């Protein structure tokens, strides 16, 4: 019965950070802090409320008392984008807090953007797949439109976003057309569009079957 | 320094019992300062303590799995082990292998040392479907990748040039598709002067179905 709270934040680097935590009684032992990296497991930086493991950048520090305590990262840094969790030892129990999701914000930068065709080895299942791919840019937010011999596609294909990057702090996105063979091999020209903040007008890759 | 090492399935069926192993390495388990366990992460949630035990064969748990679950542990084998009866839906989760300090002397006064990689066990009643890859070909700066396509659960690697390759690689998180199965791709940005010079190689795995492929991705 711990919480957490803000659940989220965002700031910039170089920004200093405080998230808070609230046990779910009087602390009477250890109450400490981890670190989770995107897909990584979490990692100790702070025991006893506010001592670091070793190794630990002097950036990391821990406080208070009772049920109320804290974490702050005096200058936060990209390699900082992490998950936080509270964790206490009570009742001859283990138990963690929901966790904080410290994020960068940034300026806005560019997508670069390619385009790709099926492979030979893909069309033998008898299936196709087109990718575009939209590389380091910032906000998160884009919009990518396919086209297929000008004729605007909709309900055939997927997006994923990738983590945001730990040192340049922008992301990655990319977008797959799924056509079958058939619808593939019917068209010439394959496209795709792509709108962003970071753009002055939105912009298109292309190619050509032969 | 002490480290931990993940093992086991990823895949277990409804009402079958998981179970996962630990192999502890740069130092022994065989102490009164360390108490060994697991932890785990539903995807999208919070960290969930399952249990710990204590090398001597003592051990505690978390009530809520504790009718469910054993952890034992063996000090010749310097290993650890966690079997959940009953598994459903509910389990899936990424599991964790983690380390009890002892802090100060004698009193209740602990930290998780050293933690696993963690595990991405699912529960399902379907099979270990594995992936196809394929390449995406190219044809200034250019960009080359693979595509991981069609498969069943999804805890999957992807490297490139067996791990020679870092700087410029951006992987996607697994995407669902109204099929059933997963799809997954990998990219690397590359200048055009490596380009048809230096060959790019991803090298793809899945554990639960035994698969194992490498593919070069040229361009046009």
């Known amino acids: 019965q711990m919480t957490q709270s803000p659940s989220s934040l965002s700031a910039s680097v170089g920004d200093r950070v405080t998230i808070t935590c609230q046990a779910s009684?009087?602390?009477?032992?250890?109450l400490n802090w981890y670190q989770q990296k995107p897909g990584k497991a979490p990692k100790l930086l702070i025991y006893?409320?506010?001592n670091l493991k070793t190794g630990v950048p002097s950036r990391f520090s821990g406080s208070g008392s009772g049920t109320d305590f804290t974490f702050t990262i005096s200058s936060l840094q990209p390699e900082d984008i992490a998950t936080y969790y509270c964790q206490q030892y009570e009742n001859l129990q283990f138990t963690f807090g929901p966790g904080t999701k410290v994020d960068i914000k940034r300026t806005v930068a560019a997508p670069s953007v390619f385009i790709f065709p099926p492979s030979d080895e893909q069309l033998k299942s008898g299936t196709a797949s087109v990718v575009c791919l939209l590389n380091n840019f910032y906000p998160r937010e884009a919009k990518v439109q396919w086209k297929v011999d000008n004729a605007l596609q909709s309900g055939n294909s997927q997006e994923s976003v990738t983590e945001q990057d730990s040192k340049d702090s922008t992301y990655s996105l990319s977008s797959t057309l799924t056509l079958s063979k058939a619808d593939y091999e019917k068209h010439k020209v394959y496209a795709c569009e792509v709108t962003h903040q970071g753009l002055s007008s939105p912009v298109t890759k292309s190619f050509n079957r032969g | 320094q002490l480290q931990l090492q993940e093992s086991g399935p990823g895949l277990v069926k409804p009402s079958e019992t998981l179970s996962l192993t630990c192999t502890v390495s740069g130092g022994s388990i065989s102490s009164s300062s360390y108490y060994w366990g697991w932890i785990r992460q539903p995807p999208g949630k919070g960290l969930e303590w399952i249990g710990s035990?204590?090398?001597?064969?003592?051990?505690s748990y978390n009530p809520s799995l504790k009718s469910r679950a054993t952890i034992s542990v063996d000090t010749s084998k310097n290993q650890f082990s966690l079997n959940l009866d009953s598994v459903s839906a509910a389990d899936t989760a990424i599991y964790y292998c983690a380390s009890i300090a002892a802090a100060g002397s004698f009193y209740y006064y602990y930290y998780m040392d050293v933690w696993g990689k963690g595990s991405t066990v699912t529960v399902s009643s379907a099979s270990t479907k594995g992936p196809s890859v394929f390449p995406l070909a190219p044809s200034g700066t250019a960009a080359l990748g693979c595509l991981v396509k069609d498969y069943f659960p999804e805890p999957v690697t992807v490297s490139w040039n067996s791990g020679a390759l870092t700087s410029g690689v951006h992987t996607f998180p697994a995407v669902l598709q109204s099929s059933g199965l997963y799809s997954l791709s990998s990219v690397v940005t590359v200048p055009s002067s490596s380009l048809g010079t230096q060959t790019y190689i991803c090298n793809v795995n899945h554990k639960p179905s035994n698969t194992k492929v490498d593919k070069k991705v040229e361009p046009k």
């Open positions: 009684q009087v602390i009477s032992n250890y």
């Open positions: 035990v204590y090398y001597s064969g003592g051990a």
């Open positions: 006893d409320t506010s």
